[PDB]
Amino acid sequence: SAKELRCQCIKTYSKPFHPKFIKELRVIESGPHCANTEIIVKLSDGRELCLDPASPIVKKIIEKMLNSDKSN
Amino acid sequence: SAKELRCQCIKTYSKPFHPKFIKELRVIESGPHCANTEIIVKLSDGRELCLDPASPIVKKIIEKMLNSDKSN
């Protein structure tokens, strides 16, 4: 009975780990909405899902869109 | 009749473009071999393939493995 799940996820693929051994680093960097807009990965041959470990980086890449429009 | 194609690719997904509008940024960052070890992406709703636009960055992420072992 917790708040309705969010769009995709807010944490790592599912678990934290060394993202260095990631075979596929996927990043949901779509426009501004809710579907894709965070980080993602494919942990070597063990874990593979989205990615959002308290890393606002990717939020800054999506954030630059708005900020780009904030030139007037 | 050109040199046998390489492993996956050496350039972008297929074409260059603003990687900013990429919906999925995938990165083949596997160990050291030849399969996956470069950058990759999913250009918004238009282009989606690997990624290696003269960007050695990703090569530096894979390179840190060796260099990590070069501590002795």
Structure summarized in a few sentences:
The PDB classes it as chemokine. Chain A is an alpha+beta fold.
Strand order of the largest sheet of chain A: 1-2-3
Secondary-structure element order of chain A, N to C:
EEEH
Taking all Cα atoms into account, the compactness measure Rg of chain A is 14 Å
Percent in strands of chain A: 15-25%
| Major sheet attributes of chain A | 3 strands, antiparallel
Envelope shape of chain A? globular
Structural class of chain A: alpha+beta
Protein name (chains A, B): IL-8(6-77)
Organism (chains A, B): Homo sapiens
Topology:
2 copies of one chain form a homodimer.
Chain A: E1 22-24, E2 39-43, E3 49-51, H1 57-69
Antiparallel strand pairs in A: 1-2, 2-3
Attribute tags:
3 strands, alpha+beta, chemotaxis, 1 helix, globular, 72 residues, 18% helix, chemokine, OB fold (Dihydrolipoamide Acetyltransferase, E2P), 15% strand
Structure commentary:
Two copies of one chain form a homodimer. Chain A has 72 residues and is of the alpha+beta class. Chain A has one domain (1-72): Beta Barrel (OB fold (Dihydrolipoamide Acetyltransferase, E2P)), CATH 2.40.50. Chain A contains one helix and three strands. Chain A has a three-stranded antiparallel sheet, with no helix packed on it. In chain A, strand 2 (39-43) and strand 3 form a beta hairpin. Chain A is globular. Chains A and B meet through strand 1 and helix 1 of A and strand 1 and helix 1 of B. The PDB classes it as chemokine.
